[PDB]
Design a protein around this ligand. Structure first.
Ligand code: HEM
Ligand SMILES: O=C(N[C@@H](Cn1ccnc1)c1ccc(Cl)cc1Cl)c1ccc(-c2nnc(-c3ccccc3)o2)cc1
Length: 470
């Protein structure tokens, strides 16, 4: 039926289970049965998978009013972030909003962020119950969720938001995060208790961001450089309107969720991998000394650059683990194929999977092997000998043909990528200073992945040993 249809027992439910349990195996099988294009049903909608590098190009460089993102996302996201931002607007508005955020993340801000993030990771160690003592075990995901949330908030969100995380400002985010409950895939409007709580969180949070904002202006200052003093002025659209406190409030919320979903997961995988690879961790420690100096002086915007393998660790973890597995778009007008029989209908979605190409023998030898050293030919923030475009938030890669595209591509491309690197880099390096990790029992491996919520993370409550260095 048009592009072939995956074989499913059930209506509506269709293939929904096989995707949910694992999207990658589900995808590798469908490649083996129908090649690079199949169509499956996910919760009562026909979703077309165009795999492969050309497949990534199709959707992410799709033209604006053939594929539409904000129509797939808005009913889940808008209750969560707040109205009038991100998906709550026509693309044109999302481009401007990105530009504000990108403007906020200039190298001068990143620099300013580095000491703050080290400060937050050093204090957490000194002060949290998690690493008390010379040797012990810790719950990686919970510990790491705390560290990432503290560091991001301190730098990006600012002092108030940060200190608010000592007051129960985290009941809220926890409660807000319920809006990403899988059920909410179709039921986001329905007022089950979790949905009601999220609306409670959303109200309170938004108020709180606004009190912060107004109170600053109530004194007419600047301090130094988070996204928000940033947005406070770093906010005028083409039309010439300053961004309202409410849109500032909701972007801050959206950014918070984005980092948290993304960086927490990755950093946890970073921790677990090292835990299985004491050779690597000790290779990193030794790299610090060599490039870094035996003194081991503090980290800076400048030094982290020199940490070549540290960066390769993050890169290679991202290769196997990038949380996002599936980028979905609403097909609006029938799309003609590259030299093939097929027409892609309206009332189809399309789904690209960056990770598949990145786990492929065709692009990567021995793909399932987690080996940083495979980048002993290459290092970048994701970089390309390929095209670039300004969709309204500055020149960025169209040149998005790489098999490795973990930050996406095209007009929706991630703009957190440097900050992610800034942070994950800063976090892992510190942890490399202070610790050796190793696997818990004498029974070892790497835990499975919970793909089930739309973003991937480690499935387990996974503890790992730790031993300090002094
Ligand atoms: C490993 C960490 C991260 C990964 C893997 C990641 C991945 C991605 C991906 C794949 C997209 C495009 C998905 C799509 O097409 O809808 C994206 C978009 C985006 N990411 Fe990230 N991201 C990361 C970190 C961050 C951080 C820290 C922020 C913010 C601080 C951020 C903010 C965004 C934003 C604003 C978009 C815009 C999407 C759009 O315009 O439609 N990301 N990210
Ligand atoms: O997690 C989601 N979005 C994140 C992704 N992210 C993280 C870092 N970079 C990108 C996100 C992106 C941008 C911003 Cl500003 C904030 C965040 Cl938190 C996400 C987004 C949308 C959905 C979603 N909305 N509708 C669906 C849907 C509906 C029906 C069927 C299948 C999916 O999924 C799920 C997760």
């Amino acid at each position: 039926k048009t592009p072939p249809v995956v074989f499913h027992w059930f209506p509506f439910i269709g293939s929904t289970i096989s995707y949910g349990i694992d999207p990658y195996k589900f995808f590798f099988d469908c490649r083996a049965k129908y090649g690079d294009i199949f169509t499956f049903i996910l919760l009562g909608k026909k979703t077309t998978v165009y795999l492969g590098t050309k497949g990534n190009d199709f959707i992410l460089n799709g033209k604006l009013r053939d594929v539409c993102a904000e129509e797939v996302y808005s009913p889940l996201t808008t209750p969560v972030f707040g109205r009038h931002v991100v998906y709550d607007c026509p693309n044109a508005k999302l481009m401007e909003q990105k530009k504000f955020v990108k403007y906020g993340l200039t190298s001068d801000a990143l620099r300013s962020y580095v000491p703050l993030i080290t400060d937050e990771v050093e204090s957490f160690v000194k002060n949290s119950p998690a690493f008390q003592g010379h040797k012990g075990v810790f719950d990686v995901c919970k510990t790491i969720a705390e560290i990432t949330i503290y560091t991001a908030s301190r730098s990006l969100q600012g002092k108030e938001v940060r200190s608010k995380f000592d007051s129960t400002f985290a009941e809220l985010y926890h409660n807000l995060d319920m809006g990403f409950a899988p059920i909410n895939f179709m039921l986001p409007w329905a007022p089950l208790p979790h949905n009601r709580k999220r609306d409670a969180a959303q109200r309170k949070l938004t108020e709180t961001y606004m009190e912060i904002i107004k109170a600053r202006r109530q004194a007419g200052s600047k301090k130094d450089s988070e996204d928000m003093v940033w947005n406070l002025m770093s906010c005028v659209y083409k039309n010439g309107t300053p961004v309202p406190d409410e849109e500032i409030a909701h972007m801050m919320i959206a950014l918070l969720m984005a980092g948290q979903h993304s960086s927490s997961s990755t950093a946890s995988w970073i921790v677990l991998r090292l835990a299985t690879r004491p050779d690597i961790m000790e290779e990193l420690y030794q790299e610090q000394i060599r490039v870094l100096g035996s003194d081991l002086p503090p980290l800076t915007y400048d030094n982290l650059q020199k940490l070549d393998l540290h960066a390769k660790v993050i890169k290679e973890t991202l290769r196997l683990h990038a949380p996002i597995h599936s980028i979905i778009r609403a097909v609006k007008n029938p799309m003609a194929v590259d030299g093939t029989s097929y027409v892609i209908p309206t009332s189809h979605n399309v789904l690209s999977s960056p990770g598949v190409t990145a786990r492929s023998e065709e692009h990567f030898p021995n793909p399932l092997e987690w080996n940083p050293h495979r980048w002993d030919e290459n290092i970048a923030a994701s970089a390309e000998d390929d095209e670039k475009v300004d969709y309204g938030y500055g020149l960025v890669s169209k040149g998005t043909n790489s098999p490795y595209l973990p930050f996406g591509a095209g007009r929706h491309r991630c703009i957190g990528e440097q900050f992610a690197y800034l942070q994950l880099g800063t976090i892992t390096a510190v942890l490399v200073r202070l610790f050796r990790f190793r696997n818990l029992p004498g029974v070892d491996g790497i835990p499975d992945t919970d793909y089930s919520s739309l973003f991937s993370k480690p499935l387990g409550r996974s503890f790992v040993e730790f031993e300090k260095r002094h």
